Scaffold this active site. Structure first.
Site, PDB file in Angstrom:
ATOM      1  CD1 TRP A   1     -12.211  28.033 -35.098  1.00 18.89           C
ATOM      2  CD2 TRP A   1     -13.303  27.282 -36.901  1.00 18.89           C
ATOM      3  NE1 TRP A   1     -13.273  27.279 -34.660  1.00 18.89           N
ATOM      4  CE2 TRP A   1     -13.959  26.805 -35.748  1.00 18.89           C
ATOM      5  CE3 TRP A   1     -13.810  26.934 -38.156  1.00 18.89           C
ATOM      6  CZ2 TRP A   1     -15.095  26.001 -35.814  1.00 18.89           C
ATOM      7  CZ3 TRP A   1     -14.940  26.133 -38.219  1.00 18.89           C
ATOM      8  CH2 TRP A   1     -15.568  25.676 -37.056  1.00 18.89           C
TER       9      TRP A   1
ATOM     10  CE1 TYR B   1     -11.278  13.800 -40.044  1.00 18.50           C
ATOM     11  CE2 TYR B   1     -10.899  13.570 -42.400  1.00 18.50           C
ATOM     12  CZ  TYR B   1     -11.628  14.090 -41.350  1.00 18.50           C
ATOM     13  OH  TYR B   1     -12.712  14.899 -41.614  1.00 18.50           O
TER      14      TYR B   1
ATOM     15  CE1 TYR C   1     -20.355  24.118 -34.227  1.00 20.86           C
ATOM     16  CE2 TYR C   1     -18.516  25.355 -35.130  1.00 20.86           C
ATOM     17  CZ  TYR C   1     -19.226  24.176 -35.015  1.00 20.86           C
ATOM     18  OH  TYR C   1     -18.805  23.050 -35.689  1.00 20.86           O
TER      19      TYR C   1
ATOM     20  CB  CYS D   1     -18.804  19.329 -35.547  1.00 18.99           C
ATOM     21  SG  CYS D   1     -18.070  19.453 -37.179  1.00 18.99           S
ATOM     22  CG  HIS D   2     -19.768  21.751 -31.086  1.00 17.90           C
ATOM     23  ND1 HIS D   2     -20.037  22.975 -30.510  1.00 17.90           N
ATOM     24  CD2 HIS D   2     -18.705  21.946 -31.902  1.00 17.90           C
ATOM     25  CE1 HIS D   2     -19.182  23.872 -30.968  1.00 17.90           C
ATOM     26  NE2 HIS D   2     -18.365  23.274 -31.816  1.00 17.90           N
TER      27      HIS D   2
ATOM     28  CE  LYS E   1      16.286   6.810   8.621  1.00 15.69           C
ATOM     29  NZ  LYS E   1      17.113   7.508   7.597  1.00 15.69           N
TER      30      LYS E   1
ATOM     31  CD  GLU F   1     -13.327  26.102 -30.989  1.00 18.85           C
ATOM     32  OE1 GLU F   1     -13.116  25.361 -30.005  1.00 18.85           O
ATOM     33  OE2 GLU F   1     -13.601  25.663 -32.127  1.00 18.85           O
TER      34      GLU F   1
ATOM     35  N   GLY G   1       5.996   0.524   4.366  1.00 18.06           N
ATOM     36  CA  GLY G   1       6.938   1.178   5.255  1.00 18.06           C
ATOM     37  C   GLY G   1       8.172   1.806   4.647  1.00 18.06           C
TER      38      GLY G   1
ATOM     39  NE  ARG H   1     -16.146  18.722 -44.733  1.00 15.45           N
ATOM     40  CZ  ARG H   1     -15.020  19.394 -44.519  1.00 15.45           C
ATOM     41  NH1 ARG H   1     -14.318  19.847 -45.549  1.00 15.45           N
ATOM     42  NH2 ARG H   1     -14.596  19.612 -43.280  1.00 15.45           N
TER      43      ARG H   1
ATOM     44  NE  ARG I   1     -22.378  18.379 -39.039  1.00 14.23           N
ATOM     45  CZ  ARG I   1     -21.310  18.130 -39.790  1.00 14.23           C
ATOM     46  NH1 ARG I   1     -21.017  16.884 -40.137  1.00 14.23           N
ATOM     47  NH2 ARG I   1     -20.534  19.126 -40.194  1.00 14.23           N
TER      48      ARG I   1
ATOM     49  CB  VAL J   1      -0.946   0.023   1.210  1.00  9.73           C
ATOM     50  CG1 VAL J   1      -2.006   1.095   1.023  1.00  9.73           C
ATOM     51  CG2 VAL J   1      -1.586  -1.337   1.417  1.00  9.73           C
TER      52      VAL J   1
ATOM     53  CG  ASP K   1     -10.589  14.825 -36.577  1.00  9.87           C
ATOM     54  OD1 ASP K   1     -10.093  13.698 -36.357  1.00  9.87           O
ATOM     55  OD2 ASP K   1      -9.938  15.764 -37.080  1.00  9.87           O
TER      56      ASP K   1
ATOM     57  CB  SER L   1      18.713   0.256  16.845  1.00 10.02           C
ATOM     58  OG  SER L   1      17.707   1.089  16.295  1.00 10.02           O
TER      59      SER L   1
HETATM   60  N1  LIG Z   1       3.479   8.018   0.653  1.00 11.59           N
HETATM   61  C1  LIG Z   1       3.513   6.765   1.353  1.00 11.59           C
HETATM   62  O1  LIG Z   1       2.690   5.886   1.056  1.00 11.59           O
HETATM   63  C2  LIG Z   1       4.531   6.492   2.451  1.00 11.59           C
HETATM   64  C3  LIG Z   1       5.535   7.438   2.707  1.00 11.59           C
HETATM   65  N2  LIG Z   1       6.450   7.233   3.671  1.00 11.59           N
HETATM   66  C4  LIG Z   1       7.449   8.236   3.885  1.00 11.59           C
HETATM   67  O2  LIG Z   1       8.714   7.786   3.537  1.00 11.59           O
HETATM   68  C5  LIG Z   1       9.627   8.265   4.521  1.00 11.59           C
HETATM   69  C6  LIG Z   1      10.205   7.133   5.226  1.00 11.59           C
HETATM   70  O3  LIG Z   1      10.800   6.135   4.440  1.00 11.59           O
HETATM   71  P1  LIG Z   1      12.387   5.834   4.574  1.00 11.59           P
HETATM   72  O4  LIG Z   1      13.142   7.172   4.605  1.00 11.59           O
HETATM   73  O5  LIG Z   1      12.881   5.027   3.391  1.00 11.59           O
HETATM   74  O6  LIG Z   1      12.633   5.007   5.913  1.00 11.59           O
HETATM   75  P2  LIG Z   1      11.963   3.581   6.170  1.00 11.59           P
HETATM   76  O7  LIG Z   1      10.500   3.757   6.451  1.00 11.59           O
HETATM   77  O8  LIG Z   1      12.135   2.682   4.965  1.00 11.59           O
HETATM   78  O9  LIG Z   1      12.601   2.917   7.394  1.00 11.59           O
HETATM   79  C7  LIG Z   1      13.971   2.626   7.413  1.00 11.59           C
HETATM   80  C8  LIG Z   1      14.487   1.964   8.619  1.00 11.59           C
HETATM   81  O10 LIG Z   1      14.013   0.635   8.680  1.00 11.59           O
HETATM   82  C9  LIG Z   1      15.083  -0.186   9.116  1.00 11.59           C
HETATM   83  N3  LIG Z   1      15.541  -1.017   8.061  1.00 11.59           N
HETATM   84  C10 LIG Z   1      15.458  -0.749   6.735  1.00 11.59           C
HETATM   85  N4  LIG Z   1      15.994  -1.771   6.039  1.00 11.59           N
HETATM   86  C11 LIG Z   1      16.430  -2.720   6.934  1.00 11.59           C
HETATM   87  C12 LIG Z   1      17.064  -3.982   6.814  1.00 11.59           C
HETATM   88  N5  LIG Z   1      17.382  -4.514   5.465  1.00 11.59           N
HETATM   89  N6  LIG Z   1      17.375  -4.699   7.927  1.00 11.59           N
HETATM   90  C13 LIG Z   1      17.073  -4.187   9.151  1.00 11.59           C
HETATM   91  N7  LIG Z   1      16.477  -3.004   9.316  1.00 11.59           N
HETATM   92  C14 LIG Z   1      16.140  -2.239   8.213  1.00 11.59           C
HETATM   93  C15 LIG Z   1      16.138   0.724   9.512  1.00 11.59           C
HETATM   94  O11 LIG Z   1      15.901   1.118  10.832  1.00 11.59           O
HETATM   95  P3  LIG Z   1      17.041   1.110  11.896  1.00 11.59           P
HETATM   96  O12 LIG Z   1      17.836   2.423  11.755  1.00 11.59           O
HETATM   97  O13 LIG Z   1      16.436   1.028  13.237  1.00 11.59           O
HETATM   98  O14 LIG Z   1      17.948  -0.062  11.704  1.00 11.59           O
HETATM   99  C16 LIG Z   1      15.946   1.835   8.613  1.00 11.59           C
HETATM  100  O15 LIG Z   1      16.564   2.983   9.080  1.00 11.59           O
HETATM  101  C17 LIG Z   1       8.846   9.123   5.419  1.00 11.59           C
HETATM  102  O16 LIG Z   1       8.862  10.431   4.946  1.00 11.59           O
HETATM  103  C18 LIG Z   1       7.529   8.599   5.315  1.00 11.59           C
HETATM  104  O17 LIG Z   1       6.582   9.567   5.656  1.00 11.59           O
HETATM  105  C19 LIG Z   1       6.434   6.094   4.430  1.00 11.59           C
HETATM  106  C20 LIG Z   1       5.455   5.129   4.207  1.00 11.59           C
HETATM  107  C21 LIG Z   1       4.484   5.310   3.213  1.00 11.59           C
HETATM  108  C1  LIG Z   2       2.643   4.626   7.314  1.00  8.27           C
HETATM  109  N1  LIG Z   2       1.842   5.801   7.090  1.00  8.27           N
HETATM  110  C2  LIG Z   2       2.232   6.761   6.084  1.00  8.27           C
HETATM  111  C3  LIG Z   2       1.302   6.682   4.903  1.00  8.27           C
HETATM  112  C4  LIG Z   2       0.529   7.785   4.526  1.00  8.27           C
HETATM  113  N2  LIG Z   2      -0.296   7.655   3.464  1.00  8.27           N
HETATM  114  C5  LIG Z   2      -0.375   6.464   2.783  1.00  8.27           C
HETATM  115  N3  LIG Z   2      -1.214   6.333   1.707  1.00  8.27           N
HETATM  116  C6  LIG Z   2      -1.279   5.161   1.053  1.00  8.27           C
HETATM  117  N4  LIG Z   2      -2.165   5.039  -0.077  1.00  8.27           N
HETATM  118  N5  LIG Z   2      -0.543   4.100   1.420  1.00  8.27           N
HETATM  119  C7  LIG Z   2       0.296   4.180   2.474  1.00  8.27           C
HETATM  120  N6  LIG Z   2       1.090   3.068   2.887  1.00  8.27           N
HETATM  121  C8  LIG Z   2       0.395   5.391   3.188  1.00  8.27           C
HETATM  122  N7  LIG Z   2       1.234   5.504   4.255  1.00  8.27           N
HETATM  123  C9  LIG Z   2       0.599   6.012   7.814  1.00  8.27           C
HETATM  124  C10 LIG Z   2      -0.142   4.927   8.273  1.00  8.27           C
HETATM  125  C11 LIG Z   2      -1.340   5.140   8.951  1.00  8.27           C
HETATM  126  C12 LIG Z   2      -1.803   6.432   9.169  1.00  8.27           C
HETATM  127  C13 LIG Z   2      -3.110   6.630   9.897  1.00  8.27           C
HETATM  128  O1  LIG Z   2      -3.261   7.579  10.648  1.00  8.27           O
HETATM  129  N8  LIG Z   2      -4.188   5.688   9.692  1.00  8.27           N
HETATM  130  C14 LIG Z   2      -5.457   5.822  10.353  1.00  8.27           C
HETATM  131  C15 LIG Z   2      -6.386   6.572   9.465  1.00  8.27           C
HETATM  132  C16 LIG Z   2      -7.167   7.723  10.021  1.00  8.27           C
HETATM  133  C17 LIG Z   2      -8.327   8.184   9.196  1.00  8.27           C
HETATM  134  O2  LIG Z   2      -9.393   7.526   9.218  1.00  8.27           O
HETATM  135  O3  LIG Z   2      -8.303   9.327   8.664  1.00  8.27           O
HETATM  136  C18 LIG Z   2      -6.000   4.458  10.509  1.00  8.27           C
HETATM  137  O4  LIG Z   2      -7.028   4.249  11.224  1.00  8.27           O
HETATM  138  O5  LIG Z   2      -5.428   3.505   9.918  1.00  8.27           O
HETATM  139  C19 LIG Z   2      -1.065   7.515   8.701  1.00  8.27           C
HETATM  140  C20 LIG Z   2       0.135   7.305   8.021  1.00  8.27           C
HETATM  141  N1  LIG Z   3      -2.526  16.937 -30.483  1.00  6.46           N
HETATM  142  C1  LIG Z   3      -2.741  17.994 -30.899  1.00  6.46           C
HETATM  143  C2  LIG Z   3      -3.025  19.363 -31.440  1.00  6.46           C
HETATM  144  C3  LIG Z   3      -2.012  20.342 -31.468  1.00  6.46           C
HETATM  145  C4  LIG Z   3      -2.291  21.624 -31.981  1.00  6.46           C
HETATM  146  C5  LIG Z   3      -3.581  21.940 -32.461  1.00  6.46           C
HETATM  147  C6  LIG Z   3      -3.847  23.317 -33.002  1.00  6.46           C
HETATM  148  C7  LIG Z   3      -3.740  24.372 -31.938  1.00  6.46           C
HETATM  149  O1  LIG Z   3      -3.487  23.795 -30.735  1.00  6.46           O
HETATM  150  O2  LIG Z   3      -3.856  25.586 -32.087  1.00  6.46           O
HETATM  151  C8  LIG Z   3      -4.597  20.954 -32.431  1.00  6.46           C
HETATM  152  N2  LIG Z   3      -5.955  21.198 -32.918  1.00  6.46           N
HETATM  153  C9  LIG Z   3      -6.291  21.468 -34.181  1.00  6.46           C
HETATM  154  O3  LIG Z   3      -5.453  21.556 -35.077  1.00  6.46           O
HETATM  155  C10 LIG Z   3      -7.771  21.645 -34.374  1.00  6.46           C
HETATM  156  C11 LIG Z   3      -8.685  21.215 -33.389  1.00  6.46           C
HETATM  157  C12 LIG Z   3     -10.074  21.378 -33.596  1.00  6.46           C
HETATM  158  C13 LIG Z   3     -10.549  21.972 -34.785  1.00  6.46           C
HETATM  159  C14 LIG Z   3     -12.024  22.146 -35.035  1.00  6.46           C
HETATM  160  C15 LIG Z   3     -12.240  21.968 -36.512  1.00  6.46           C
HETATM  161  C16 LIG Z   3     -12.696  22.941 -37.366  1.00  6.46           C
HETATM  162  N3  LIG Z   3     -12.735  22.397 -38.639  1.00  6.46           N
HETATM  163  C17 LIG Z   3     -12.301  21.096 -38.590  1.00  6.46           C
HETATM  164  N4  LIG Z   3     -12.202  20.237 -39.671  1.00  6.46           N
HETATM  165  C18 LIG Z   3     -11.760  19.045 -39.373  1.00  6.46           C
HETATM  166  N5  LIG Z   3     -11.592  18.008 -40.385  1.00  6.46           N
HETATM  167  N6  LIG Z   3     -11.405  18.628 -38.083  1.00  6.46           N
HETATM  168  C19 LIG Z   3     -11.489  19.432 -37.013  1.00  6.46           C
HETATM  169  O4  LIG Z   3     -11.174  19.050 -35.889  1.00  6.46           O
HETATM  170  C20 LIG Z   3     -11.981  20.798 -37.293  1.00  6.46           C
HETATM  171  C21 LIG Z   3      -9.629  22.391 -35.769  1.00  6.46           C
HETATM  172  C22 LIG Z   3      -8.245  22.224 -35.567  1.00  6.46           C
HETATM  173  C23 LIG Z   3      -4.312  19.672 -31.920  1.00  6.46           C
END
Ligand SMILES: NC(=O)C1=CN([C@@H]2O[C@H](COP(=O)(O)OP(=O)(O)OC[C@H]3O[C@@H](n4cnc5c(N)ncnc54)[C@H](OP(=O)(O)O)[C@@H]3O)[C@@H](O)[C@H]2O)C=CC1
Ligand SMILES: CN(Cc1cnc2nc(N)nc(N)c2n1)c1ccc(C(=O)N[C@@H](CCC(=O)O)C(=O)O)cc1
Ligand SMILES: N#Cc1ccc(CC(=O)O)c(NC(=O)c2ccc(Cc3c[nH]c4nc(N)[nH]c(=O)c34)cc2)c1
Ligand SMILES: NC(=O)C1=CN([C@@H]2O[C@H](COP(=O)(O)OP(=O)(O)OC[C@H]3O[C@@H](n4cnc5c(N)ncnc54)[C@H](OP(=O)(O)O)[C@@H]3O)[C@@H](O)[C@H]2O)C=CC1
Ligand SMILES: CN(Cc1cnc2nc(N)nc(N)c2n1)c1ccc(C(=O)N[C@@H](CCC(=O)O)C(=O)O)cc1
Ligand SMILES: N#Cc1ccc(CC(=O)O)c(NC(=O)c2ccc(Cc3c[nH]c4nc(N)[nH]c(=O)c34)cc2)c1
Ligand SMILES: O=c1[nH]c(=O)n([C@H]2C[C@H](O)[C@@H](COP(=O)(O)O)O2)cc1F
Ligand SMILES: O=c1[nH]c(=O)n([C@H]2C[C@H](O)[C@@H](COP(=O)(O)O)O2)cc1F
Lengths: 508, 506
Positions: free
Chosen positions: A303, A453, A329, A389-390, A55, A281, A112, A244, A410, A7, A413, A76
């Protein structure tokens, strides 16, 4: 032999998960997802084990999580026996012994930090991955989620959600291994007997080679698939047809796309879309303008092809000025049935102002079933540089004060016009919602002739090779008084991280 | 442990399968289905066994079927060992010895007349049923298929096919005895209430789902309408409207129907097809006179065309049934200055229908075959704004005519079945005049709603398992599209459920 799932919530591009011992964001719904997915069990007399590094154990305050057992990996920390909800192990391998001796543990979750993630993936301990993609990239990270190995495939991608203007997704990845019932056989036999008399054979399911992320079979929730699947359906069933222009298409008839606008903005991510040109447009339509030079003066050239001297002379409008597109239009929205002369005349007061009547009706009579804006005027079709067309759009006010939009197109393109149409009517619905005092709802697009086309085949196939990313957010910086007062500076596009642009030429 | 399946083709109502030692019909595709379903095996070194009675063995000429082993149930036939492809048994029970001995038999099929069918069902030997419902009932039968026991549930119902103007279906009956993706979606739905769009489009509950046992085999396109009803009953918001009768409404829906092998006339309810046709030809002729429909015993436009209703919406200057410029006036005289229902409008406005017909046969691959009825300049003069607002038409490469329709508001109880059949007939009329074949019909709906006084009725309609669609054929070829008459329409094989009375909201 119980299941082990990762996740994690990581950024969309660089896969950052942490910074300075904490998260780079604060999304409440994501934590609730973590809580619900780690508490999800089947036996009432068992608990789930959450493995995390030291972390990470520090980052959550060194306090237990209810109904679950936390397993801290540390070299640790003292192996204390006082707290039964927190247990310490010296390495990840020895910690994955909840499979055997610990029959009281049902599921195992790895969550994690980078060190534990990378060790769990390198040693092939992980079966599933619950990924929360977050649309935040221009910030600082110091902890990343490892690149998902090729042994995993995505099986689910949720719709885009929004929290504090931050877009995010939910995905599931499964590790691939080795290698109803009779309904499929009966349908295949019926398809062999009836060739194309069976309607199913005229709507064949796209083959894997043209299917975007084919591993996601039952979880194609992200609404960008509503557009990508239409591409695949055309590539599978599109008939080669002339039109055409000199560029033939592959065409099908009667399709539908659905998009959410409550939690995201339907701007395609599999390709960088010119959002500014779309807006310019749209405001050009709203102001009622048919002068193509006003778009060219703002570096918008969409155009230009349908408004050149050669094109206008070819379709029999040589009397027009170079970019005089005619009543289109923007002229049917504000001056329906108005006698068109040129693009320079003053049309204030001419025709029916559908847009004004629409806004007035939306806020005065919301549950009315007639919030319709049309552009198909049979009396003015011959004067247009291009028929609409629209063609028609309908608007709907839900019981919770949201504004949804239906659009009939109708001709579509799929390479150029379709992404523009999706974003354009999304913005228009949002504008109508703010002026009328509602919230954006849903966007449904009903398509007649959906086509590709033939000079776009290499490009669109390239676009089909890109897995979609979360939709961005579109917010207005200020509240306007009239719908015509919107400016490009009033638009804020948040969290748009698309794939590179794909150049495609328009058929004139 | 081995599988036993019944294969049978029976009539839709009385379940007749035979007459005078032969079949009551001749459907070639049905025989090909029998051949393919009885040859369908997994082991190349095994064969399937087809059990049949003696009289059935006589009806097929007493000749073996290729790649299969025929098992004849008879008390008099000699147990000959010469032919290895035909073996005789004295009773059905002793005949089910392919299960224990003879490992060379993979699947077993029962298909041998009423006596063998009834015995195989009474002794609970049958696991699956492959039923071919045939839409033929006003003929003579002497052999019937037994009523399917309640221990069976349908799991598949195909689209309606047509052979020599005969409609038929294909069904599968089963005897009743990913993983984490659904859990993740449910968890996301608990976190986000209605912020998740899936919760705003919930799947209908079983109590409002038509034949809920057919889960993965809802091929019959009448389900495209019945499931829309269920979706409204599940997600429809209770809303007021211009009438006094509130509705349950949802926004943005779609229905798709085939017209190549059937006609989309609902079978779960008897639909007044004649009134639908008379309304459509009333539109085509450009007529806005509501009396012309009332003179033909068609009263669907009586509510929206009364003196009290017209005076209420501000049209008291109109005659009793002067509906104003509506459907058919925008089709034939778009943007035409409307006066009264009696004036002569020949030449006024744009004739969209004529231009549509001319464009369909002169430029078929054109992307602009559009017929619209939404005229913002004439909305105030209409007795009712257009519901079927805009339609588009498409000519396939194999010379078929498909139709797309956008409907802004859809009364699923009354207007929707009429709209489906009406635009189906219109597409067929356009197809014959232009020289094409009927294609597909897609309907895109804005406000799909159910009026609250239709709830008891529509739930009743949802309790009825659909039947094969009928066929609609033209008796003659017309020169102009306006020349169609009700006598030129032939409705073949329509066996609907009883009519369901529903009141219109004025
Ligand atoms: N957007 C998201 O879904 C999520 C985002 N995050 C974010 O990412 C960041 C954290 O991730 P990150 O910086 O990578 O740190 P981590 O969450 O991956 O945790 C790292 C720690 O886990 C332990 N560890 C890792 N690998 C090993 C191993 N091979 N063997 C034993 N221990 C290990 C170490 O702890 P130790 O030093 O104790 O040995 C290490 O320092 C945070 O900012 C967090 O908010 C985190 C989860 C989800
Ligand atoms: C590990 N972590 C960071 C984090 C943040 N966003 C994420 N988002 C996604 N999609 N997946 C993740 N693993 C994830 N992890 C977490 C994990 C749990 C909660 C947390 O507070 N969970 C509550 C949610 C509270 C709520 O209902 O708003 C729970 O009940 O599980 C926050 C950050
Ligand atoms: N990806 C991409 C991309 C990048 C640049 C441009 C031009 C711009 O960004 O200025 C475009 N759009 C067009 O080049 C474009 C789009 C819609 C029309 C309406 C229209 C009038 N009469 C037509 N007759 C024919 N047959 N067909 C048609 O779509 C039209 C006419 C031209 C698309
Ligand atoms: N629409 C469809 O799918 C099908 C239709 N049919 C039609 O149905 C008709 C035939 O059916 P049906 O009239 O019922 O005749 P059957 O095909 O069921 O054959 C009956 C004969 O089988 C033997 N038999 C039946 N039961 C027993 C038993 N318990 N013990 C020993 N022998 C038994 C008897 O032969 P014996 O006199 O030698 O003792 C009996 O006369 C035909 O018209 C045929 O075309 C047939 C198959 C399929
Ligand atoms: C027993 N019987 C009557 C008959 C006719 N239609 C049916 N239809 C159905 N759906 N189910 C049946 N059991 C059935 N039975 C039969 C059986 C086989 C053939 C027959 O000629 N079969 C050829 C079919 C030839 C062809 O391809 O058309 C084969 O190869 O199986 C005809 C009548
Ligand atoms: N089962 C059944 C059944 C049995 C008999 C009949 C009448 C007949 O067979 O002649 C009907 N059809 C109608 O009674 C009917 C059908 C369609 C319309 C169109 C219509 C106009 N304005 C409307 N306004 C509302 N709200 N809704 C609507 O459907 C309409 C109006 C009435 C259905
Ligand atoms: O908004 C638009 N969307 C669109 O898809 N097109 C494309 C569709 C088609 O390729 C062409 C219209 O040509 P036609 O009138 O033959 O359909 O323009 C044009 C627009 F202005
Ligand atoms: O073809 C039709 N189909 C239909 O569904 N209605 C119903 C829809 C709605 O119940 C009513 C129109 O009410 P409103 O004008 O508010 O949409 O007519 C009317 C038709 F003529």
């Amino acid at each position: 032999e119980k299941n082990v799932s990762i996740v994690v919530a990581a950024s969309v591009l660089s896969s950052g998960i942490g910074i300075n011992g904490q998260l780079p964001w604060s999304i409440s719904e994501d934590l609730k997802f973590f809580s619900k997915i780690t508490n999800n069990k089947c036996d009432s007399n068992k608990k789930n084990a959450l493995i995390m590094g030291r972390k990470t154990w520090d980052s959550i305050g060194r306090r237990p999580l209810k109904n679950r057992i936390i397993v801290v990996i540390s070299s640790s920390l003292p192996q204390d026996e006082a707290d039964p909800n927190v247990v310490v192990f010296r390495n990840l391998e020895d910690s994955i012994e909840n499979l055997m001796n610990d029959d009281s543990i049902e599921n195992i979750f790895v969550c994690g930090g980078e060190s534990i993630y990378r060790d769990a993936l390198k040693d092939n301990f992980v079966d599933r991955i619950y990924l929360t993609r977050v649309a935040l990239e221009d910030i600082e990270f110091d902890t990343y989620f490892p690149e998902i190995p090729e042994t995993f495939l995505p099986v689910y991608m949720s719709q885009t959600f929004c929290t504090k203007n931050i877009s995010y997704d939910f995905m599931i990845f499964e590790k691939q291994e080795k290698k109803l019932k009779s309904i499929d056989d009966t349908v295949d036999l019926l398809g062999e007997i009836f060739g194309i008399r069976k309607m199913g054979n005229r709507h064949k399911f796209p083959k894997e080679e043209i299917y975007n992320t084919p591993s996601i079979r039952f979880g194609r929730e992200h609404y960008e698939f509503q557009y990508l699947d239409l591409l695949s359906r055309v590539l599978e069933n599109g008939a080669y047809r002339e039109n055409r222009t000199g560029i033939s298409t592959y065409s099908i008839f009667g399709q539908m796309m659905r998009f959410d606008m409550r939690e995201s903005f339907p701007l395609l991510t599999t390709k960088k879309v010119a959002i500014r040109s779309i807006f310019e447009e749209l405001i050009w339509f709203i102001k009622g303008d048919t002068n193509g030079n006003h778009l060219i003066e703002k570096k918008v050239y969409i155009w230009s092809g349908n408004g050149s001297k050669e094109y206008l002379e070819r379709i029999g409008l040589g009397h027009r000025e170079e970019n005089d597109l005619g009543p289109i239009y923007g002229f049917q929205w504000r001056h329906y049935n108005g006698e068109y002369k040129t693009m320079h005349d003053d049309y204030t007061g001419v025709g029916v102002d559908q847009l004004a009547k629409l806004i007035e009706t939306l806020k005065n009579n919301p549950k009315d079933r007639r919030h319709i804006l049309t552009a198909w005027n049979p009396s003015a079709l011959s004067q247009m540089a291009l028929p609409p067309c629209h063609v028609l759009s309908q608007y709907y006010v839900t019981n919770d004060n949201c504004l949804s939009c239906n659009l009939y197109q109708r001709s579509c393109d799929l390479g150029l016009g379709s992404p523009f149409n999706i974003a354009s009517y999304a913005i228009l619905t949002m504008m109508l919602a703010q002026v009328c005092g509602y919230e954006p709802g849903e966007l449904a697009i009903f398509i007649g002739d959906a086509h590709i086309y033939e000079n776009h085949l290499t490009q669109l196939k390239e676009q089909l090779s890109r897995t979609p990313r979360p939709f961005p957010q579109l917010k207005f910086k200020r509240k306007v008084e009239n719908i015509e007062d919107f400016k490009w500076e009033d638009i804020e596009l948040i969290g748009y991280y698309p794939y590179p642009t794909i150049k495609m030429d328009m058929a004139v």
